[PDB]
Design a binder for this molecule. Structure first.
Ligand SMILES: CCCCCCCCCCCCCCCCCC(=O)OC[C@H](COP(=O)([O-])OCC[N+](C)(C)C)OC(=O)CCCCCCCCCCCCCCCCC
Ligand SMILES: CCCCCCCCCCCCCCCCCC(=O)OC[C@H](COP(=O)([O-])OCC[N+](C)(C)C)OC(=O)CCCCCCCCCCCCCCCCC
Ligand SMILES: CCCCCCCCCCCCCCCCCC(=O)OC[C@H](COP(=O)(O)OCCN)OC(=O)CCCCCCCCCCCCCCCCC
Ligand SMILES: CCCCCCCCCCCCCCCCCC(=O)OC[C@H](COP(=O)(O)OCCN)OC(=O)CCCCCCCCCCCCCCCCC
Ligand SMILES: CCCCCCCCCCCCCCCCCC(=O)OC[C@H](COP(=O)(O)OCCN)OC(=O)CCCCCCCCCCCCCCCCC
Ligand SMILES: CCCCCCCCCCCCCCCCCC(=O)OC[C@H](COP(=O)(O)OCCN)OC(=O)CCCCCCCCCCCCCCCCC
Ligand SMILES: CCCCCCCCCCCCCCCCCC(=O)OC[C@H](COP(=O)(O)OCCN)OC(=O)CCCCCCCCCCCCCCCCC
Ligand SMILES: CCCCCCCCCCCCCCCCCC(=O)OC[C@H](COP(=O)(O)OCCN)OC(=O)CCCCCCCCCCCCCCCCC
Ligand SMILES: Nc1ncnc2c1ncn2[C@@H]1O[C@H](COP(=O)(O)O)[C@@H](O)[C@H]1O
Lengths: 347, 19, 320, 459, 120, 49, 101, 50, 140
């Protein structure tokens, strides 16, 4: 792949996301969505093996179905309102269709079946781009239309996403599938707290983006895609084992790490509206995400798995990868709890 | 007498396609 | 980094420095085939850089001060013990073969990096494409098990698939009887332990498995013992070849840029050599690996990165 | 409380900038200096607490626990430096760093005026102990012990977070000084029943309650010696401090919602003492004894009378010191014979006489020999439970008989009888082990002269 | 929540009303903690690249601390402004609607009655 | 010389060192100036002068 | 077959072998004797002794002695004037409004 | 100094005490205003406590 | 599914056993039909007969659980003369769990289902009595 063509395609992805974010017209939202998806397809097919083409095919089919549903909701809203301003919708059918289209684009359960296969079939950098950047635009569109969202539908999608993500991630050994199920659970949390205070949703989105970026950056720094290849890291670079230990502890929401702050503020917001059963259920379910995170930390940092002979040949050479912003997001994802009142900048 | 560290069987259990 | 996408954007095209003398030449043969001095005389005729044959301590020569490390830090294996006792209980034979394959892969990456960055041809001795011959001979002699062959095939399948074959492969035909006469004339006390069956198996897997599969993807020149001494005939044959086979023809700037990006990252080169496949020969325990790694870190010039070692005489660390 | 927090975090550059051989000396010296400094918290008044700031305060309940923590840290540094002898230097500094961090979280936990800050520190204490257990433990099942411990604590404590946030939204503040004056009766309903369960189950798990105690004979056993000391001596008392602080909001619903746990903990101590009678492992026997004593503290807190509260805090401090000493003695035996079986190494009084004297003193304080503070706490709890009901004297007398039985069974099995013939590596006792034993014993015996400083905020 | 407030003047980090507020001190404890975060990130950057942690590249660690202090100062300014706006809107709405916020008839404890539950 | 190959970080990149120190000094003086005018405008608007 | 490559269990080191005067603190005799001196001085001579002296002379811990003195004063004052020493009601019934029933 | 590592911690204690005193001065809103300890100021002083 | 729950909760407890049992059976059959639809969608059967047999089995099991729970809770409310009491719903939930154990033909899963679904039914009864909200409307 040419460096210049790669640059143009990446700026086209960001341009599509910007076009979705800044526009006041529904047709422009649709245009930005298709521009983003069309530009991001070649990032998935960088390596040209059958798994990448299979993942690209499944991603294309899912995004095209969601896009057609979104256009249907927009046309129904135009029919029943005569305008295109991106604001609250004037039909329950249009609201339901748009909510399910955005759920399909985000990959929340029960539309979650494409996320782990697509994440597994593509490289680590493209998977990072997908699971981090692709979710900024549907959450912005959801942030713009909350007066029309059905509460029962979005809460059902949230609790289903959390439970299905935890139960799915319990069984995986590949790192990309673990990251995908973790993503599903976190989007469940984010859209759970959406209708009460969307600022908490923005804070959770930012924290999840930073933590996922740190974990994926460590993964490509060590070039590990499985559990055992990650377990070999103690005999190559133990500082990376310490970093993945603290980041995986923070991903589980354990205090006093920075991953405790989103669910803490979400539980704080949900109890103000006299909803007590759902935050307890979501915490008890997030214990499963903590379980497979702790299993990863057992295999990687807190024990010494047997290594092989050629690790000496790997000892004799230093790393030269451009681990971009890795110390910054490593610090920002673990020691940010004393700066919790900084969330007022997002309102 | 020393600390126990995982054997080949531990990692071989951890290294399947599914857990 | 010294080379990256920014340099390739700014006009660094590898086809500009690629002349007609930039060829990759691999010399093969039996144990004492005399291919060494033939490779030397070829390399000093077309003015190509000679890479001597990679041993256990090749990576020690590439890094650090270039002096050979102790055997417990590099290799953890002995060639002399393989010659004395090929059927040893500790699995020295396959451990040595795997380490030598990794060293040959590192040497191939270094050769390709030099070729793509300087545009100068490189003469090699027994590259990675002619390394499985010794593994097949060791398996046919019963020295190693089937699992060792399966592990080697997995590592080779995931490593050799992203490299380009040599331009010219030169093979030197010396019979096993003359090979045995040469090794008794040499005087090495452990090299006289080599049986005739091992050399016969090496010759059989050179002739019947290596040359038929390499004549399709590259060009093979084959010589006898006495006509290999005339290096002028060999350099005439190399200068009069018609290069029309192999994947070297359909190489544009983008493909060679990706290849050069691959071969200059040595940790990305050796990523798949230590795959988590637990064989009794190559799996090292946790305590032993920890002890050896802590011993290796305390070596002079090895504790930190290359430019940041105070005890070996580096300055301006606080500004670096 | 910043005059104790700042030297504790300054211990971290002290252990990360010391020499390769001077880390233990420096850390032990400066931790002992801060432990001496911790006596300035004894400026307590008969009416008002010692309120430092908006975030920190320390009444007469949290002060003995603070002094115990800050005194316990150099003991763990002295204990844990023999089995970490051959360890890498960076791993040694990481171990000392986890101990320092745990002490910092513990001294920020007991002084937290806000309840949610207490919760945050009380669950920040989970990570260093889990890392210590699962990394420097010696056995295979240290990973399973860490999983059990972590998940019992978190499953107990997430409803506590939900209930504390509900109390914050309903009352308007979680400040403990405000809630003493703004408290309201909690009527009888199902909502308040689940409020009581949510506010109580975290500290019932952490104490532990009988039936929720399954994580204790694992985490107390597969841990290293310093981990076992900090788990038995301090970490079980976070539950006691939490129930002492949180019972203020749960009235008058406690008087009938406390019945099932009173029956669980009155019958539970008999079961755990009987388990102690038939234990093949010394460390497990000490852990089950800890379960029984914490069941006593649970009953004392639940009946909520002044005598019960004084007995509960005195018993907490006394059991912390005694359990730490017993774990240290068992660790010394483990270093000598490399096995935790109680029947293996016998008759050690003929070989180790002064260690046998230390064993006898620890056993005597375990069975509450008067006038030790063990007996003072146990006696006050017995008096208050007799005031509660009269058949509690039958239960307490049975518990005392079995407690004396298993303590003397420990002593007679390990120290008395004929020595093992084939064991010949019984080295003489080092000065370090004897100094550790005496530093556990002498404060415990000295506190009987002035027992008024460990009797809680309503002495 | 406050989009109607931040809707007439969009995409402004700090509106002109923020300059009436006291700026954070340069000895702010939050700013010092953010500088410590920057120092920790510099040390991690030294550590992952196998450099001497406390000695290599003092210019890099100084730029880390400086960048963290700069960004943290501006974020703290915005945070203080937004809490000020929250309080201002709250008090204006309380004052504008006196019917919905009546004065509570406070009574001394000699008139109120509380049930007594004995602990025996 | 100790090494067989000259390391890429064998000598400090003086251009990068100068850029780092200049950027840090520029950021510090810009922050100080911004804080000074901020407190001046606060005292001007509030009349605390 | 033969299993993976691993060092055997090392023999336990006797600290009394190379150093019969060991206190068990460190393998170097100087570090060991200095650790013993540090622990014995700063633990027993400093913390225990001066801590016991500090606790012994605490300035009227929790106002018990003041309470005894004030109780003596109040008992003398109430006994001199024929007053009852203590009443059944802590607060005055005059300043208490009972609920009407 | 060759023993600065032995003066890291006591200066930490001194700095913590100084910060405690500073915060105590910061919390002086009810100095000489409490109903139990309200009294007239003796001359040659300005505050009851610091 | 909204009208089924209202028509179940419109009947006073301990009053009409047949109508309460019918409403509970309809709710159970609907849930079993949803489960069977997802089962035959994701895990495709070998033939039409296997799929319709799985559908009938799941629907019948869920409907039997619902009928047994409704009948047992209504009967216990009738006998004890305590209509507003979660103990009746606990008894009905344990009866439903024992029916689930009878259908699957194993004692242990039946006992575990008795305990867990009796606790769940009791919690639903407490929520109906105290007005707990599960999908709470936004308020602040
Ligand atoms: C270690 C294992 C055991 C752990 C046990 C943990 C405690 C057990 C009970 C926890 C209940 C859940 C938290 C309740 C918090 C209540 C706060 C409150 O305001 O209550 C009043 C509120 C009342 O609602 P409200 O306050 O919104 O309404 C205003 C008040 N009224 C009703 C008068 C209008 O209660 C509730 O909202 C519901 C409380 C009951 C919740 C039942 C569901 C959970 C069941 C137990 C789960 C236990 C853990 C399971 C998993 C274990 C591990 C796998
Ligand atoms: C405190 C909570 C945390 C607990 C863990 C703490 C760990 C760190 C330890 C720090 C240092 C120790 C702190 C606690 C110190 C307690 C001791 C103390 O200070 O006591 C003060 C008490 C104070 O007593 P007092 O209160 O009666 O004194 C009156 C007060 N003044 C002095 C002001 C007038 O000291 C004594 O009681 C000493 C009395 C004299 C010495 C003893 C004489 C008799 C000895 C026995 C004689 C023989 C009897 C028969 C024997 C038969 C055979 C067995
Ligand atoms: C309300 C919120 C509104 C929005 C706020 C802003 C949101 C920001 C979201 C950031 C999303 C990051 C997406 C992923 C990285 C994008 C850049 C990219 O393309 O990186 C991949 C690229 C591939 O190159 P290649 O060499 O092939 O890598 C394979 C490894 N050899 O290169 C590499 O792989 C190089 C290796 C290092 C890559 C590091 C990338 C880090 C990116 C994340 C930084 C932290 C997040 C942003 C800051 C906080 C935002 C909240
Ligand atoms: C397993 C390990 C070992 C053990 C660890 C600890 C496990 C037990 C912890 C919880 C114990 C149960 C909860 C506490 C019960 C205390 C007594 C009580 O109040 O029972 C409730 C109720 C009493 O009846 P009544 O007084 O009429 O109730 C009306 C109240 N408004 O009672 C009844 O009506 C009878 C029961 C009805 C169902 C209750 C379900 C909710 C409570 C359990 C959850
Ligand atoms: C570091 C942050 C650098 C920010 C540079 C300035 C960008 C800018 O102008 O942001 C404007 C935005 C507030 O604009 P507003 O329209 O009020 O917010 C709508 C959000 N729902 O400002 C913000 O949202 C400020 C917070 C941005 C944080 C981004 C990284 C996390
Ligand atoms: C009672 C009636 C139940 C009817 C629904 C189940 C029908 C069924 O199982 O059909 C089998 C079919 C798969 O057919 P199969 O044989 O695998 O295809 C290869 C060619 N013979 O399976 C399918 O086609 C799966 C989808 C069947 C329809 C599901 C939704 C409607 C039924 C459930 C809700 C009512
Ligand atoms: C009752 C009963 O018979 O249970 C037997 C059943 C297993 O059935 P089986 O014996 O195989 O025929 O076993 C089961 O169904 C599982 C056990 C039944 C429930 C036992 C509950 C009490 C257990 C002790 C709790 C102590 C605290
Ligand atoms: C662990 C799991 C704990 C679950 C706790 C559930 C707490 C109760 C919530 C549901 C409930 O019973 O709500 C009561 C409600 C009737 O009251 P109300 O809201 O007034 O309904 C009339 C419509 N305006 O009822 C309704 O609105 C309809 C009935 C809802 C039943 C939900 C449970 C069904 C069975 C389990 C799935
Ligand atoms: N796979 C291998 N196993 C053992 N020895 C090898 C292997 N590959 C090359 N050699 C060595 O290569 C020598 C032949 O190269 P040369 O002497 O340069 O012709 C032999 O004598 C062996 O010592």
């Amino acid at each position: 792949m040419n460096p210049i063509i790669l640059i143009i395609i990446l700026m086209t992805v960001m341009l599509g996301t910007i076009i979705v974010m800044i526009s006041t017209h529904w047709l422009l939202i649709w245009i930005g969505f298709e521009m983003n998806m069309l530009a991001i397809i070649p990032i998935m097919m960088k390596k040209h093996n059958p798994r990448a083409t299979e993942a690209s095919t499944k991603y294309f089919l899912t995004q095209s179905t969601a896009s057609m549903l979104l256009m249907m909701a927009i046309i129904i809203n135009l029919m029943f309102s005569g305008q295109w301003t991106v604001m609250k919708l004037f039909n329950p059918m249009a609201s339901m269709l748009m909510t399910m289209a955005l759920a399909m684009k985000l990959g929340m359960a029960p539309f979650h079946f494409w996320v782990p296969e697509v994440t597994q079939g593509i490289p680590l950098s493209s998977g990072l781009i997908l699971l981090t950047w692709q979710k900024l635009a549907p959450m912005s569109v959801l942030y713009q239309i909350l007066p029309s969202i059905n509460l029962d539908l979005i809460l059902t999608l949230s609790i289903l996403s959390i439970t299905i993500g935890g139960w799915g991630g319990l069984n995986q050994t590949q790192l990309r599938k673990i990251m995908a199920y973790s993503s599903i659970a976190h989007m469940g949390w984010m859209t759970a707290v959406l209708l009460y205070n969307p600022t908490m949703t923005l804070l959770n989105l930012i924290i999840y983006i930073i933590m996922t970026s740190t974990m994926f950056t460590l993964f490509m720094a060590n070039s590990t895609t499985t559990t055992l290849s990650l377990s070999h890291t103690w005999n190559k670079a133990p500082i990376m084992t310490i970093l993945v230990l603290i980041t995986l502890l923070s991903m589980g929401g354990l205090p006093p790490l920075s991953g405790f702050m989103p669910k803490w503020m979400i539980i704080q917001e949900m109890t103000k509206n006299d909803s007590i059963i759902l935050p307890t259920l979501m915490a008890i379910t997030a214990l499963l995400n903590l379980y497979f995170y702790m299993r990863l930390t057992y295999s990687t940092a807190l024990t010494m798995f047997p290594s092989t002979n050629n690790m000496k040949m790997k000892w004799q050479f230093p790393t030269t990868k451009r681990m971009t912003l890795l110390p910054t997001m490593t610090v920002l994802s673990t020691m940010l709890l004393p700066l919790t009142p900084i969330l007022s900048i997002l309102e | 007498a020393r600390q126990w560290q995982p054997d080949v069987e531990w990692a071989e259990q951890y290294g399947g396609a599914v857990m | 980094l010294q080379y990256g996408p920014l340099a390739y954007i700014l006009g660094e095209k590898t086809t500009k420095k690629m002349t007609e003398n930039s060829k990759l030449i691999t010399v093969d043969g039996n144990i004492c085939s005399g291919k060494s001095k033939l490779a030397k005389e070829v390399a000093e005729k077309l003015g190509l850089k000679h890479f001597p044959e990679a041993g256990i301590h090749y990576a020690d020569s590439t890094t650090g001060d270039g002096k050979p490390l102790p055997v417990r830090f590099s290799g953890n294996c002995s060639l002399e013990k393989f010659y004395d006792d090929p059927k040893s209980n500790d699995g020295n034979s396959y451990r040595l073969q795997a380490w030598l394959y990794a060293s040959r892969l590192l040497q191939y990456a270094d050769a390709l990096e030099h070729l793509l960055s300087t545009g100068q041809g490189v003469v090699l001795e027994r590259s990675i494409y002619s390394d499985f011959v010794f593994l097949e001979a060791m398996y046919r002699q019963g020295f190693i098990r089937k699992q060792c062959v399966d592990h080697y095939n997995q590592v080779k399948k995931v490593t050799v698939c992203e490299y380009l074959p040599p331009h010219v492969v030169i093979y030197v035909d010396v019979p096993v009887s003359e090979v045995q006469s040469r090794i008794q004339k040499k005087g090495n006390p452990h090299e006289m332990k080599i049986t005739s069956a091992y050399l016969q198996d090496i010759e059989n897997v050179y002739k019947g498995t290596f040359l038929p599969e390499m004549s399709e993807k590259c060009e093979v020149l084959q010589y006898s013992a006495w006509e290999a001494e005339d290096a002028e005939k060999v350099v005439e044959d190399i200068q009069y070849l018609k290069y029309d086979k192999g994947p070297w023809l359909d190489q544009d700037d983008r493909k060679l840029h990706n290849l050069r990006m691959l071969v200059q990252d040595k940790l990305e080169v050796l990523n798949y050599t230590s795959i988590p496949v637990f064989l009794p020969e190559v799996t090292i325990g946790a305590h032993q690996s920890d002890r050896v790694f802590q011993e290796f870190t305390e070596l002079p010039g090895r504790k930190y990165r290359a430019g940041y070692n105070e005890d070996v005489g580096d300055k301006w660390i606080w500004l670096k | 409380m910043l005059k104790y927090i700042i030297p504790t975090m300054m211990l971290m550059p002290l252990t990360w900038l010391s020499k390769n051989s001077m880390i233990w000396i420096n850390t032990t010296l400066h931790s002992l200096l801060i432990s001496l400094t911790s006596l300035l918290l004894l400026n307590q008044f008969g009416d008002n607490s010692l309120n430092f700031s908006l975030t920190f305060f320390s009444d007469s309940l949290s002060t003995p626990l603070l002094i115990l923590t800050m005194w316990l840290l150099p003991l763990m540094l002295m204990a844990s430096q023999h089995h970490l002898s051959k360890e890498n230097l960076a791993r040694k500094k990481l171990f000392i760093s986890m101990l320092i961090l745990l002490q910092l979280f513990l001294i920020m936990t007991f002084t937290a005026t806000e309840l949610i800050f207490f919760y945050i520190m009380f669950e920040a204490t989970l990570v260093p102990t889990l890392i210590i257990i699962t990394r420097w433990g010696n056995q295979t099942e240290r990973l399973n012990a860490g999983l059990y411990f972590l998940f019992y604590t978190l499953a107990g404590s997430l409803p506590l977070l939900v209930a504390l946030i509900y109390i914050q939204n309903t009352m308007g503040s979680l400040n403990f000084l405000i809630l003493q004056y703004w408290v309201q009766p909690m009527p009888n309903s199902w909502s308040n029943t689940f409020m009581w369960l949510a506010c109580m189950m975290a500290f019932m798990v952490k104490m532990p309650l009988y039936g929720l105690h399954l994580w204790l004979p694992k985490a107390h056993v597969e841990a290293p010696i310093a981990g076992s000391m900090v788990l038995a001596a301090i970490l079980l008392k976070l539950g006691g401090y939490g129930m002492m602080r949180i019972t203020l909001l749960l009235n008058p619903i406690t008087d009938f919602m406390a019945y099932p746990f009173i029956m669980l903990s009155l019958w539970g101590m008999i079961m755990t003492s009987s388990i102690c009678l038939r234990q093949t492992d010394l460390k497990s026997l000490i852990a089950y004894s800890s379960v029984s004593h914490m069941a006593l503290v649970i009953v004392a807190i639940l009946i909520q009378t002044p005598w019960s509260y004084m007995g509960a805090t005195a018993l907490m401090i006394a059991h912390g010191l005694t359990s730490s000493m017993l774990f240290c003695l068992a660790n010394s035996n483990y270093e000598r014979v490399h096995s935790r079986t109680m029947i293996l190494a016998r008759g050690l009084q003929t070989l180790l006489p002064l260690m046998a004297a230390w064993w006898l003193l620890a056993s005597l304080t375990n069975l509450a020999l008067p006038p030790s503070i063990n007996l003072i706490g146990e006696l006050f709890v017995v008096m208050s439970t007799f005031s509660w009901s009269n058949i509690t004297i039958i239960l307490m007398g049975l518990n005392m008989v079995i407690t004396a039985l298993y303590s003397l069974y420990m002593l007679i099995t390990t120290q008395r009888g004929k020595h093992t013939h084939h064991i010949n590596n019984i080295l003489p006792s080092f000065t370090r082990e004897n100094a550790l034993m005496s530093l556990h014993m002498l404060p415990l015996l000295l506190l009987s002269l002035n027992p008024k400083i460990i009797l809680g905020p309503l002495y | 929540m406050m989009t109607g407030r931040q809707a007439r003047a969009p995409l402004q980090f700090l509106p002109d009303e923020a300059r009436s507020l006291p700026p954070p001190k340069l000895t702010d404890p939050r700013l010092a903690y953010i500088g410590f975060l920057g120092y920790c990130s510099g040390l991690i950057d030294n550590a992952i690249r196998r450099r001497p942690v406390l000695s290599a590249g003092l210019h890099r660690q100084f730029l880390y601390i400086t960048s963290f202090v700069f960004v943290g100062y501006y974020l703290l300014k915005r945070q203080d402004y937004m809490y000020a706006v929250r309080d201002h809107d709250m008090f204006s709405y309380i004052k504008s609607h006196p019917e919905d916020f009546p004065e509570k008839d406070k009574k001394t404890y000699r008139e109120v009655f509380e049930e007594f539950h004995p602990v025996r | 010389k100790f090494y067989i190959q000259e390391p890429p970080h064998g000598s400090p990149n003086w251009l990068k060192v100068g850029l780092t120190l200049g950027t840090s000094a520029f950021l510090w003086i810009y922050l100080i100036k911004q804080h000074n005018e901020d407190v001046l405008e606060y005292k001007r608007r509030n009349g605390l002068e | 077959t033969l299993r993976w490559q691993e060092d055997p269990e090392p023999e336990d080191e006797n600290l009394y072998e190379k150093n019969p005067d060991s206190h068990g603190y460190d393998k170097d005799p100087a570090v060991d004797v200095w650790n013993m001196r540090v622990v014995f001085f700063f633990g027993f001579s400093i913390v225990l002794v001066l801590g016991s002296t500090f606790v012994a002379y605490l300035p009227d811990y929790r106002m018990q002695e003041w309470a005894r003195r004030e109780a003596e004063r109040l008992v003398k004052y109430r006994e001199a004037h024929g007053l009852p020493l203590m009443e059944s009601n802590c607060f005055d019934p005059s300043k208490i409004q009972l609920p009407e029933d | 100094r060759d023993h600065w590592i032995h003066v890291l911690v006591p200066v930490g204690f001194v700095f913590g005490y100084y910060l405690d005193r500073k915060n105590d001065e910061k919390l002086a809103a009810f100095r000489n205003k409490s109903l139990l300890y309200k009294r007239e100021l003796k001359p040659q002083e300005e505050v009851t406590w610091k | 599914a909204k009208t089924l729950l209202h028509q179940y909760w419109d009947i006073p407890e301990g009053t009409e056993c047949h109508r309460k049992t019918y409403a509970a059976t309809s709710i159970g059959g609907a849930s079993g039909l949803v489960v069977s639809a997802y089962s035959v969608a994701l895990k495709t059967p070998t033939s039409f007969l296997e799929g319709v047999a799985r559908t009938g089995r799941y629907t019948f099991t869920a409907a039997a659980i619902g009928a047994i729970f409704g009948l047992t809770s209504c009967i216990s409310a009738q006998v004890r003369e305590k209509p507003d009491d979660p103990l009746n719903y606990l008894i009905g939930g344990c009866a439903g769990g024992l029916t689930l154990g009878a259908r699957t033909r194993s004692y242990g899963i039946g006992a575990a289902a008795c305990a867990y679904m009796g606790l769940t039914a009791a919690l639903v009864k407490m929520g109906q009595l105290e007005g707990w909200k599960v999908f709470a409307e936004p308020k602040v």
